[PDB]
Write a protein that binds this DNA or RNA. Structure first.
Lengths: 81, 92, 107, 96, 98, 83, 94, 107
DNA sequence: ATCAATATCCACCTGCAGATTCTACCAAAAGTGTATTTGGAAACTGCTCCATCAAAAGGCATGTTCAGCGGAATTCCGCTGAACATGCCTTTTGATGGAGCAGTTTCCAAATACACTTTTGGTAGAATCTGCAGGTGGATATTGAT
DNA sequence: ATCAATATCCACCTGCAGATTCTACCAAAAGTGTATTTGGAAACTGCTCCATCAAAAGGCATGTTCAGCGGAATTCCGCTGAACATGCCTTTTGATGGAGCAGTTTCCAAATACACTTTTGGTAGAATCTGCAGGTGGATATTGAT
């Protein structure tokens, strides 16, 4: 498990900008977006996993992610949370 | 055993749109919505009661909570259904 | 005799007993008066009615009979108040409202 | 041999993607990223498939909203192309 | 006649106001506005001296930060003058407009 | 007809001072009426919540605690008056 | 009349261990009070949710700890956890 | 012989008080014995951290009494405290000195 | 580069608003000893679902060419905001009745607590059903070269 | 404006996964029904502190002038959108073994529940102390004109 941040491929970032209403994208946007996503995921997984452990579990649950998102003000509906 | 508001959501769905269904993922979101508003109102009520050194949450705290949490028109109608329900409940 | 549920006594579809129970177990105060659950069940029932009323319309407008997440998203985002009540909420599989800034259109 | 002008297909895509709701990042690739980041936090962790899905649903909704603000920031610069300076201003004002 | 070039005096004011902490809106006028706005929510109200004070403190801090973000949006536009457009764009991204 | 509407009591010189604190060097004329609008919306949101706290406690006086609590709800926590 | 509790005397005592010759104005003491009530609520509130998620009736130092880990930024958290663990250990050994 | 829990934990903060405040706060049905010790230790530590930095700020201004401005300068010049108090306004604190470079006179 | 007008500093000074030390009375804490109750861990273990290996195939990622067009650098004109001195109308400050925030006291409607009795919302496993995804095709735009 | 190459709208249509539909079990819910405890509304009242009014206080509104900047226009180079060829790795369909979560039961360390004794933090009023904010002075850096 090494360099998966590149799984977020140029095409996929483009589709996301599109849904976002973006018509033209500069070449340096793709590395910037990966950076942004990495921090976002780091913060959510950090909190989610803290919930896992407090409950002495080895399996991260949907609820763990949902409580982590609510802590960060990004309430998500649909998975129990 | 795990409860959800699914059947009540479904009854209500049948009153407003007698011939419309709902996919499970959508019911799931509806269950989320109801639990969300519930915690938001109760919590608002909880603080409300504390700030006033009261140890009881009544229909009155729930009402202020509703006023602080919901936007304009939605509150107006929520407060109505709420007052209405308590009055009707109290006569039986 | 006859034993009528607190919900029917209030004229509600939502469960008054359940809500009352949930109120006590969630530790919000030492005591929970009888009106609290009745009133809360009612506000909760009114809110789900308003959103289903609107989602059901988005379904119909897209020629569908079953409400899916995108229908809940459209109803919420297209409603000024529900949009704010849920201003910091993400509806999974909801997409976004179609919207393209003007300077990006041709001619 | 017929050729659409630059931007015509991009507008076609915006209308297409703003109309549907499927996730846009490939699933397997996204999952490895989750496991990689989580792992570098704590080893021997396992994931319920719905947990990875919830992280993905949140992540994509977060980036899409970010691109709208970015897009607004670029246009504010009298441009039609988003650049890093735009993403950065949107995050700096968001409080990120 | 001695005259300072445009910007020399403003720049002096930025240095001065970033060093101090006193409120910058005159109190009475503020108090009148506060009470007026209040009057639409409930008649015949009274305000503790400290409540008006808290509101001014909160309001000023809020405006001073909105001005910071506005400058940033103006500079983004490659200007050095904040305009309606810039306050508008900042409130929008702050989620205050959306 | 007198000399001032209340929101016009928030004056150019004061608004300027605020901006200065925010590091603004040059200000466009239209900004002034624009700022008053934003201030009005900000106070309506806070005073409304605070007053709802006043009524709930059956009082006729808005207390610092009523503002401090409204501010906290609106995510604008203020230290100094209870908090 | 009545009583109005505040953390002031405790805040003052701590000010001395840190800056024996330094003082603090009234308004500043109010901010510190606000600061202490604020962190308390945040930590307790979080501890409260943790217990509820896990279907527990009790808030133990365990919950206070995880709350701290969730609320405080890195280094702050590191030390905060340290001090907390030390205080309990010492309290017990007595 | 009655000794205070604060002395046993070896803390300046009121352990008996924090306990009382946890119970009344309705945070849970029960409150363990060590939780108030722990929570008071954390409260004390953070309190020292801010006064420690504000004190310094007082010294840098050739002043011996800490005022709001000193607490504001302490918090915003510290990455971590600034984050912890990211959505908090310190009354009478002012802002940090800062002028965007492009607004400076061309030397 | 040369003054000349001002702004900014610094070292020192002193009055007073706000910080401090002091005694006392005391209800509300907070600590202590005893009795009873219970939340939740250790222990055993049924059972869901998570990781994983397998294989087939096409959706979709990657790498390239080519040229249209846009970021951004530069020049520029009038328009508009910064500076400033000029004149007073509004804010600020210190002083005074009374309106309400509270402290106290009373007493009942309403909320626990506990024992039964009764209705019911989940759910384990079914079999039957129906809305729509996705393939097809042809009528209708929408685009771009000329 | 006409025309050719594409994309798009769209109603008809069949396979299938996901939704509605019982049958039966049920313990956890919810409700009915005495008995016990009490929270806080309500009435009365005392003491702040808030609204208001006078006057000593110190900003703000107003018009003139011009320098500098918003934004319109022009220009060019290079980079990013289309289109296309090639093939790989995601995705989809399955089955498998097991780790790890979650149900159930036994039991004790820790927590609740008074009841009693001691102590302590908040309050009120009185008196004395002191850190620093402006106010002065004279030195010097800053700015803008020549």
């Amino acid at each position: 498990l090494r360099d998966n941040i590149q799984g977020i491929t140029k095409p996929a970032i483009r589709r996301l900008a599109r849904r976002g209403g973006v018509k033209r994208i500069s070449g340096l946007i793709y590395e910037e977006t990966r950076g942004v996503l990495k921090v976002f995921l780091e913060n959510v997984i950090r909190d989610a996993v803290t919930y896992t452990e407090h409950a002495k579990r080895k399996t991260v649950t949907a609820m763990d992610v949902v409580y982590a998102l609510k802590r960060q003000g990004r309430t998500l509906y649909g998975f129990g949370g | 055993r795990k409860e959800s508001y699914a059947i009540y959501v479904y009854k209500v769905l049948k009153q407003v749109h007698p011939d419309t269904g709902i996919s499970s993922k959508a019911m799931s979101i509806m269950n989320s919505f109801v639990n969300d508003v519930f915690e938001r109102i109760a919590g608002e009520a909880s603080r409300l009661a504390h700030y006033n050194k009261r140890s009881t949450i009544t229909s009155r705290e729930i009402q202020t909570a509703v006023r602080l949490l919901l936007p304009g028109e939605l509150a107006k109608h929520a407060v109505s259904e709420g007052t209405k329900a308590v009055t009707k409940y109290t006569s039986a | 005799a006859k034993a009528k549920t607190r919900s029917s006594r209030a004229g509600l579809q939502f469960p008054v007993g359940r809500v009352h129970r949930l109120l006590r177990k969630g530790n919000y105060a030492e005591r929970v008066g009888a009106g609290a659950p009745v009133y809360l069940a009612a506000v909760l029932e009114y809110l789900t009615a308003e959103i289903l009323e609107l989602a059901g319309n988005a379904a119909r407008d897209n020629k569908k009979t079953r409400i899916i997440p995108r229908h809940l998203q459209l109803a919420v985002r297209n409603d000024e108040e529900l949009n704010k009540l849920l201003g910091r909420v993400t509806i999974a599989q909801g997409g976004v409202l179609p919207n393209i800034q003007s300077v990006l259109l041709p001619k | 041999p017929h050729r659409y002008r630059p931007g015509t297909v991009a507008l076609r895509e915006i209308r297409r993607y703003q109309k549907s709701t499927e996730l846009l990042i490939r699933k397997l690739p996204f999952q490895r990223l989750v496991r990689e980041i989580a792992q570098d936090f704590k080893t021997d962790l396992r994931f319920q498939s719905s947990a990875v899905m919830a992280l993905q649903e949140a992540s994509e909704a977060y980036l899409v909203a970010l691109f709208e603000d970015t897009n607004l920031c670029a246009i504010h610069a009298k441009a039609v192309t988003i650049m890093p300076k735009d993403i950065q201003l949107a995050r700096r004002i968001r409080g990120e």
